[PDB]
Design a protein around this ligand. Structure first.
Ligand SMILES: COc1ccc(CC(C)(C)NC[C@H](O)c2cc(O)cc3c2OCC(=O)N3)cc1
Length: 375
């Protein structure tokens, strides 16, 4: 009855408002605030602008299509709205793939990251992704490569009020497979590699710092200056290697200058035949170890949290769009065992994940503070 129509309309309008508000908040936070113009944040901007465009151009239109039960904007605008929908979905998934690739760098080769990857390069690659998505969406649709041979589709291609998405056995596969799965597979593999490599860079920081913790304890349990020499020299090598071992490393690099001097102060006292007060000189090493192990816990957790947050973004996008593409694949291999409403339901879950991205960004402290300061 009309009660269900009104309830659906109000909840879907709330969905529209949430999506638009979150996406414009993300765009404003990136554009205005001076601390939110990193190369990754440009890709976040691309994802948010794709989400905002999808919202404005699709969600009210799809709502009208499923509430009025018939399209009321013409065949051209129907073919344009479907093109926008496919374009925005492909742009979102490909932008997530590019985000994963970007996080493959700056975790593997930051030296090549902050050298040849700048804001201009980020803009170029973002426009390249958008052009590829626009091609693969508009062209097969605009030049009518998706037209279905089944007669009611031909009726709706000239009905001027029927906007049912009927596709042949080619656009279904050669669209779902490519647009979702290829960026999906690439992004999943690349981000799994990113997570494994992050678990490895942290491990490398540790093993190097693990021996510094160990050789610190043996200093107190020492009789003469012979072993404090062995402990301090290798510890100096560990400190130098740790100094040799990205953004926010400015604090990291500067601290090691203080660190290395401490061993030289202790080692020189050790290199005199006198150890009892060089024992006391190594006591300050605990203060340094406690002060920077704190800094590293903090930065690693901020990095682990940021990596998880991008991981939560990719995971929620996958979990909200995979059912739709799965039922698309299994729907066209056979003769329509899936009702349209279930198809619409899963497609609209994929629609409504668009507002999930700003919420997940709010998990990161920086984006949360930026959004709070905007509001
Ligand atoms: C009642 O009739 C209709 C009318 C409209 C719609 C919405 C639709 C336009 C299908 N949304 C498109 C969807 O987002 C999508 C995205 C993508 O990247 C690739 C593909 C894709 O559709 C299926 C495909 O074969 N490819 C659903 C039912």
């Amino acid at each position: 009855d009309e009660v269900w129509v009104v309830g659906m309309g109000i909840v879907m309008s709330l969905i529209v408002l949430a999506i638009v508000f979150g996406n414009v908040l993300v765009i404003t936070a990136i554009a205005k605030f001076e601390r939110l113009q990193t190369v990754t944040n440009y890709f976040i901007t691309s994802l948010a602008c794709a989400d905002l465009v999808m919202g404005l151009a699709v969600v009210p239109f799809g709502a009208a299509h499923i509430l009025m039960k018939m399209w009321t904007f013409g065949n051209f605008w129907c073919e344009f709205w479907t093109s926008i929908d496919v374009l925005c979905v492909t742009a979102s998934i490909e932008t997530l793939c590019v985000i994963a690739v970007d996080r493959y760098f700056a975790i593997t080769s930051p030296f090549k990251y902050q050298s040849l990857l700048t804001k201009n390069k980020a803009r170029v690659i973002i426009l390249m992704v958008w052009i590829v998505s626009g091609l693969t969406s508009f062209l097969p649709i605009q030049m009518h490569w998706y037209r279905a041979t089944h007669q009611e589709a031909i009726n709706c291609y000239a009905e001027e009020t029927c906007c049912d998405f009927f596709t042949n056995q080619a656009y279904a596969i050669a669209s779902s497979i490519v647009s979702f799965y290829v960026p999906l597979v690439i992004m999943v593999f690349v981000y799994s590699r990113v997570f494994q490599e992050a678990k490895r860079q942290l491990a490398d920081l540790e093993d190097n710092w693990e021996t510094l913790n160990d050789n610190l304890k043996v200093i107190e349990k020492a009789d003469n200056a012979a072993q404090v020499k062995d402990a301090l020299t290798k510890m100096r090598a560990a400190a130098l290697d740790a100094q040799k071992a990205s953004p926010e490393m400015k604090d990291f690099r500067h601290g090691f200058d203080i660190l290395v001097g401490q061993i030289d102060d202790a080692l020189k006292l050790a290199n005199e035949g006198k150890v009892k007060e060089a024992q006391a000189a190594a006591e300050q090493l605990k203060t340094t170890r406690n002060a920077y192990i704190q800094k590293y816990l903090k930065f690693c957790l901020k990095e682990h949290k940021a990596l998880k947050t991008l991981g939560i973004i990719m995971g929620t996008f996958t979990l909200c769009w995979l059912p739709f593409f799965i039922v698309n694949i299994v729907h066209v291999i056979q003769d329509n065992l899936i009702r349209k409403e279930v198809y619409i339901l899963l497609n609209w879950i994929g629609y409504v994940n668009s507002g999930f991205n700003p919420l997940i960004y709010s998990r990161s402290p920086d984006f949360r503070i930026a959004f709070q300061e905007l509001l």
